[PDB]
Nucleic acid binder design. Structure first.
Lengths: 68, 50, 212, 136
RNA sequence: CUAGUCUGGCACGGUGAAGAGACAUGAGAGGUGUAGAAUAAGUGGGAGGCCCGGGCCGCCGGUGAAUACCACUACUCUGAUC
RNA sequence: AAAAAUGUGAUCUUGCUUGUAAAUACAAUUUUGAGAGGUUAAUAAAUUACAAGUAGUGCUAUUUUUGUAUUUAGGUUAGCUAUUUAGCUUUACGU
């Protein structure tokens, strides 16, 4: 009866300095509620960021896979 | 006995009397044990006061 | 309803930190009440009786047109027969101050012809009802009414206070007063299990300090 | 369901896995990873008939409802992963996707990249069916 | 009706850490209906007693019971746990 | 409405709390017009009366004079504005 996506914080996604753009986006992360850890729940995730979104003035057809 | 002292702290006389009766036996022994525990509770209260 | 045992109820002579005044002090009995409603039908009141009453300070109204009126003037109280009653009209109650001014009254042979009237109850439970049993004659017992019996009542503060001790009279006369005081309080104590939380010690005036 | 980040500088991104077969249509909006979802609707919720779940008008209404629910949570831009039936049978999306991609565009949702994530098999087992085929 | 078998409870049979819920203790802040120069703090208070001949607010004008010298109390947070 | 005071132990009619009334418009109208709801009731909202408790008081409850007579009647609930003269709101201080 309660809205499920209410107690969800937003953590910004960072990229290494070898590329151009630092920030990527945000993803809903639950709070550290007692026993469970938000850093433990945010352990294995994989995003999909294209090369045109990663580096500015290059080609667009190539892509990569970014693990966090 | 420490549990009975905690029941005396939370002040449940009927449940404490039934528990002491179930532990030791007869109601005379339970009534004497409850008065002895109340006496040593007053002694510990006097010791905590001074 | 079980607070008791008089094995170690002694050594009350330590009163140097409490009493360092010139005059004599009033050691009082107070208690913290629990499970009590102030407004509704829950009423905690009674008359605790002492044998050797130490020193209750209160004023006594004296009326009469007899030898009592002539002998009460040696007490150096402002005694006056009819103009004192004329001073206390129904105006001192319209004025916000309390129009009582006396904790005791007179019921003697001078007003025995005026007392049998419809006026019955009142502040009898509060303890302002004169009688012949407690010496309200006021020609000789006016000085002795300084040493009078005690009583207690309740109010909206939800607390209790009564005067049971005075560290003139020694503590040997006060220990039996303590015995009789707790003996009448246990007997006079609706359903209420263990109202006694912590009996207080008290003197005339001062600052807080814990001792049981 | 609120976005604390700046509205003018950067718009909140998501993705939609638009499934459109011949008799079924999903509108499943998830995050950029894909593990945590946002919303998902079916054709059976709108139309109480299994014969026309892949309908253009019902797909338009479902896309507008999902776009309104997505603007309630505050995600502005979406990538479009256009799934199909896939597998060994067919490689053709349904007709409801042509209406739904126009509906979510006209509803006021920003459009990012559009690509297919259809599970296309290279070399697999025997296809479901006899030698003679579909007889009608 | 039972051997046999299954399950539950009782003693043998304790310990360290994290998380959730309840209870208690030592302390510090803690009190603005009308009205009054002032958190009226509190009731029996006491017109006075303390300290070094002198120091304070009074009694009270005004509030429904007014300050020093004796008690933690109805009750709101901080709060360390043998 | 304010004042002698014998009184009822000198002494007033209770801002509070608890039980009772029997008072306390309908309509417009946000689902709803209708018969109740869950008005209303029960029965801790309150202004008046009764009894209890006591915050309010010694419960219950008593008497003399004054307010006579200038009996009056009219009117202000006087504004804001202007250096002064004077001008001049059926009272807005969301309008």
């Amino acid at each position: 009866v309660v809205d499920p996506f209410s107690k969800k914080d937003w953590y910004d996604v960072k990229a290494p300095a070898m590329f151009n753009i630092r920030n990527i986006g945000k993803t809903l992360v639950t709070r550290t509620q007692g026993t469970k850890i938000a850093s433990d729940g945010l352990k294995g995730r994989v995003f999909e960021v294209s090369l045109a979104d990663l580096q500015n003035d290059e080609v667009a057809f190539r892509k990569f896979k970014l693990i966090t | 006995e420490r549990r009975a002292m905690e029941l005396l702290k939370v002040s449940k006389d009927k449940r404490a009397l039934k528990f002491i009766k179930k532990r030791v036996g007869t109601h005379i022994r339970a009534k004497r044990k409850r008065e002895e525990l109340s006496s040593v509770l007053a002694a510990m209260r006097k010791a905590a006061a001074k | 309803s079980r607070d008791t045992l008089y094995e170690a109820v002694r050594e009350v002579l330590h009163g140097n930190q409490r009493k360092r005044r010139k005059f004599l002090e009033t050691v009082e009995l107070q208690i913290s009440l629990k499970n009590y409603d102030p407004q509704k039908d829950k009423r905690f009141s009674g008359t605790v009786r002492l044998k050797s009453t130490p020193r209750p300070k209160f004023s006594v109204c004296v009326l009469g047109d007899q030898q009592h009126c002539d002998e009460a003037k040696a007490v150096d109280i402002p005694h006056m027969d009819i103009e004192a009653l004329k001073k206390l009209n129904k105006n001192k109650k319209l004025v916000k101050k309390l129009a009582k001014k006396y904790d005791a009254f007179l019921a003697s042979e001078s007003l025995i012809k005026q007392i049998p009237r419809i006026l019955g109850p009142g502040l009898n439970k509060a303890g302002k009802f004169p009688s012949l049993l407690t010496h309200n004659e006021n020609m000789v017992a006016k000085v002795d009414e300084v040493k009078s019996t005690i009583k207690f009542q309740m109010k909206k503060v939800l607390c209790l206070a009564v005067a049971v001790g005075h560290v003139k009279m020694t503590d040997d006369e006060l220990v039996y007063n303590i015995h009789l005081a707790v003996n009448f309080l246990v007997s006079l104590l609706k359903k209420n299990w263990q109202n006694v939380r912590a009996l207080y010690i008290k003197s005339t005036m001062g600052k807080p300090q814990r001792l049981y | 369901s609120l976005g604390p980040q700046v509205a003018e500088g950067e718009n909140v991104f998501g993705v939609c896995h638009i499934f459109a077969s011949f008799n079924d249509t999903f509108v499943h909006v998830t995050d950029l990873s894909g593990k945590e979802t946002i919303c998902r609707v079916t054709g059976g919720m709108k139309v109480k008939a299994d014969r026309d779940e892949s309908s253009p008008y019902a797909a338009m209404l479902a896309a507008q409802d999902v776009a309104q629910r997505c603007k309630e949570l505050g995600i502005t831009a979406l990538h479009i992963k256009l799934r199909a039936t896939g597998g060994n049978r067919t490689k053709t999306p349904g007709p409801g996707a042509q209406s739904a991609l126009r509906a979510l565009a006209r509803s006021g949702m920003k459009i990012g990249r559009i690509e297919d994530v259809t599970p296309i098999p290279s070399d697999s087992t025997r296809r479901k069916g006899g030698r003679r085929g579909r007889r009608l």
